[PDB]
Design a binder for this molecule. Structure first.
Ligand SMILES: O=C(O)CCC(=O)C(=O)O
Ligand code: NI
Length: 298
């Protein structure tokens, strides 16, 4: 199996025949993902058909977004650090979709099983705006400029799954323990490797795309050292401080420091796979719901 294209990041678009087996397809593809930080995998149609949309009323209901996170991001130019502070509230998908009305991208009581049944036509967001490359570019530029002006909110690490219970192909929830990611515009994930240096799949079920950045394994030593130049204090005692604190570095910056930085856009109905020793970070282009798990190939 070869890659179909590159955005700096390999893009694989296999037939259902090869995509069929998750551990075989990941075993045959590991060499590419072990060079670049991440890898995109666009699934065949025979896969999509296996999905049940719109999600049943109950499914849309089981979605609980507990302890939302608000991020105060402090920094000047390409160098920022976030401090997560939790809200004790918990949201449902409808409240979340509503909440996203306060987190708009720049231009240029009690609920009932009936409410979610009504919501089966209202759960998605318009996407004819994220097709424009210049639009995405514009947003990303605004994102980095205005990082420290607003505090974004992220419904991250919320246990659950909206994959079909009987889906036995590439089902994040059940692999041979998954979490949902309720995204809002400007919600960010800082630079990091996975716990115990595992892999991870990330599939967007619906909503706005994500911006991804990764460090080619080759340059992870340059990267780690540079991030020591910066944030000298945080680096002092702690050897694994990138796993401790939340730092944000822009590609443009890293690039102009000898550090290669991959970048790609992650759309709904697509998988991102991160690999051991592949640093990654980014943000969400708006309201969305994703699902992910850490895993190993041995
Ligand atoms: O979706 C996120 O918030 C961060 C990305 C991530 O943790 C992953 O899927 O590996
Ligand atoms: Ni990750």
């Amino acid at each position: 199996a070869p890659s179909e294209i590159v955005g700096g990041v390999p893009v694989f678009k296999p037939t259902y025949e090869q995509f069929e087996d998750f551990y075989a397809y990941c075993k045959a593809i590991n060499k590419y993902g072990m060079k670049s930080g991440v890898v995109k995998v666009i699934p065949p149609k025979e896969w999509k058909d296996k999905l049940d949309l719109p999600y049943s009323a109950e499914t849309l209901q089981k979605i609980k977004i507990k302890s939302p996170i608000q991020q105060h991001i402090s920094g000047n130019k390409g160098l920022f650090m976030v401090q997560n502070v939790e809200k004790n509230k918990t949201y449902n998908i409808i409240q979340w979709k509503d909440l996203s009305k306060d987190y708009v991208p720049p231009e240029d009581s009690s609920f009932n099983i009936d409410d979610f049944e009504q919501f089966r036509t209202e759960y998605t967001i318009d996407l004819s705006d994220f097709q424009n490359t210049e639009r995405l570019k514009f947003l990303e530029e605004y994102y980095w400029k205005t990082l420290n002006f607003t505090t974004p909110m992220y419904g991250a690490d919320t246990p659950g799954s909206i994959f079909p219970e009987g889906l036995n192909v590439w089902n994040v929830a059940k692999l041979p323990d998954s979490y949902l990611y309720a995204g809002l515009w400007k919600a960010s994930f800082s630079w990091h490797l996975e716990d115990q240096d595992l892999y991870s799949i990330n599939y967007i079920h619906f909503g706005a795309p994500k911006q991804w950045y990764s460090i080619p394994q080759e340059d992870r030593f340059k990267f780690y050292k540079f991030m020591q130049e910066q944030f000298p204090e945080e680096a002092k005692n702690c050897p694994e401080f990138l796993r401790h604190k939340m730092f944000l570095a822009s590609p443009k910056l890293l690039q102009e420091n000898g550090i290669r930085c991959n970048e790609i856009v992650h759309h709904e109905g697509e998988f991102m796979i991160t690999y051991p020793y592949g640093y990654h970070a980014g943000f969400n282009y708006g309201y969305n719901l994703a699902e992910s798990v850490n895993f190993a190939l041995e």
